[PDB]
Design a protein around this ligand. Structure first.
Ligand SMILES: Nc1ncnc2c1ncn2[C@@H]1O[C@H](CO)[C@@H](O)[C@H]1O
Ligand SMILES: Nc1ncnc2c1ncn2[C@@H]1O[C@H](CO)[C@@H](O)[C@H]1O
Lengths: 295, 295
């Protein structure tokens, strides 16, 4: 079937530009488990012209991986090798022979944005200003604008899936569910999606249509996560209630420590009609203006 | 879409025969996480005519549930209410209103068969004889024969998905991926399956066709798990290698502490041609004969 074809073909192009000798990779502690596998901290010797060891992160299949998980890992690999942007996590290589499939990616020092925000507070030990939060949102919007121009839909935008690198630089990550959208400006999935309900656009939930505008919806939820310093969306509400809640026009209320303009932006991202939501270029301009205003 | 229809309809038949008052249910420690959600130990007051409290297990959606996970939970509910057999886990009810969806099922005292076997040894503190192991396999084969006659394919048969109840009674569980097969004697899935590669039949892996005969393949792997007291199938072999390994005719070798007849049975379950594999009625007769022989 489709996966056996991909796997056999994959083990046919041992692309030297992505293939990295397994003996030059040393695996360390588990950093956590993502959408399709686990992520471990690692170090790589003589990686991509870099002298000595380079600290990296490695993505691999969990125990008892399914075909769906293997497909997702190959998908992320396929996408990551096409993209390059300061706010998208960087692929360094892969190990595809003489062992389990491994993706070698850029190591983000502070881990996920969600964890980063939860360890913080507003000015809980790290002090973040509203200015910092706007900056984080803006960097992500910039990365998304790039991905959108690349005709890619991310589909799984959320604070758990953004990484914080050295210098507090946002890196969009987790591309296992991302899809090419060039031909039709949409990705449609017949079966049920594997993206969490509470981050999914109304038309994606009901009609299984994914577009950049559905990514914009997810960015609105992400925005809410940032402003609430890693709060849980639709708190206390079961995911199965979201069908009725969304279609009757309900949205999350304005959270604490959130300006009228910021909330307006969230609401705009959650407009029922995808065409009424702003594009990422619009979003970036909105955030930029908020930044300069409070100065 | 299909899920919104199921959810709305579900919240339309608050079937009194399955609905249980949420106030009469008290949740306890997490027992673990399954294919679509988490399982917690619980107690239910005045459950199904039973006076007082009854200890039960409860299945619910994990944090950040996806539509796929919600569908799987509803699927398991739909199946469990149709089945009744001493070696299939029993459904007691559900909570579907005024809170998160909860399935209330029979509590198995010893937890999963995999954990049960790993804590043991052959005669590691619990002493199991080969006779006990055959008995466990036989009970499971009996349950599967029942499910097969019911025109259901389980699809996710594995030691992790069998439960051990009081008296060391096997209970087949985890029906989230189980499918009705009445019309065509097969279930075909277009997209990649979410069943672990190493338990999946060759034709299911390559062609996405699931039948009772593919369940028989899984039973062979389960058999191997039982005989090895909870070993890990295809040890040291990456799941993505199984495509080539299986299609070139390779199978797991005869493990230690395993008779020629038992291994023969495993191999028969893993015949490439589904029609050459035994049916569950055959499997039960094979195990029965091994039982009486060693006496
Ligand atoms: N490139 C990476 N660098 C550091 N941590 C990561 C990376 N990718 C994923 N993680 C972490 O792995 C876990 C599962 O995605 C999360 O804790 C997440 O932050
Ligand atoms: N009905 C049940 N009774 C006891 N434990 C269960 C039940 N269903 C699932 N579990 C446990 O929950 C975890 C995840 O499936 C495993 O440890 C499994 O054994």
């Amino acid at each position: 079937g489709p996966l056996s074809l991909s796997v056999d073909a994959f083990k046919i192009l041992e692309d030297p530009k992505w293939e990295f000798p397994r003996k030059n990779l040393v695996l360390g502690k588990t950093l956590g488990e993502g959408e399709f596998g686990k992520v471990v901290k690692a170090t790589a010797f003589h990686l991509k012209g870099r002298a000595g060891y380079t600290t990296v992160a490695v993505k691999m299949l969990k125990e008892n991986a399914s075909p769906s998980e293997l497909r997702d890992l190959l998908s992320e690999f396929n996408v990551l090798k096409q993209v390059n942007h300061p706010h998208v996590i960087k692929l360094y290589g892969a190990c595809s022979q003489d062992g389990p499939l491994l993706l070698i990616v850029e190591y983000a020092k502070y881990g996920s944005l969600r964890g980063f925000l939860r360890e913080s507070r507003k000015v809980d030990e790290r002090a973040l200003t509203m200015g910092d939060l706007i900056s984080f949102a803006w960097q992500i919007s910039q990365g998304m604008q790039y991905l959108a121009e690349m005709k890619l839909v991310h589909r799984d935008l959320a604070a758990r899936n953004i990484l914080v690198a050295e210098g507090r630089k946002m890196k969009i990550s987790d591309f296992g569910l991302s899809r090419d959208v060039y031909e039709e400006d949409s990705y449609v999935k017949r079966s049920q999606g594997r993206i969490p309900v509470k981050w999914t656009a109304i038309e994606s939930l009901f009609d299984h249509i994914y577009t950049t505008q559905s990514d914009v919806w997810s960015f609105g939820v992400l925005l809410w996560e940032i402003v609430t310093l890693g709060g849980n969306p639709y708190p206390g509400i079961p995911p199965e209630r979201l069908f009725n809640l969304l279609k009757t026009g309900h949205r999350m209320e304005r959270p604490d420590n959130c300006s009228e303009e910021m909330y307006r932006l969230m609401l705009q991202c959650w407009k029922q009609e995808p065409d009424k939501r702003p594009v990422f270029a619009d979003i970036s301009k909105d955030l930029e203006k908020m930044m300069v205003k409070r100065r």
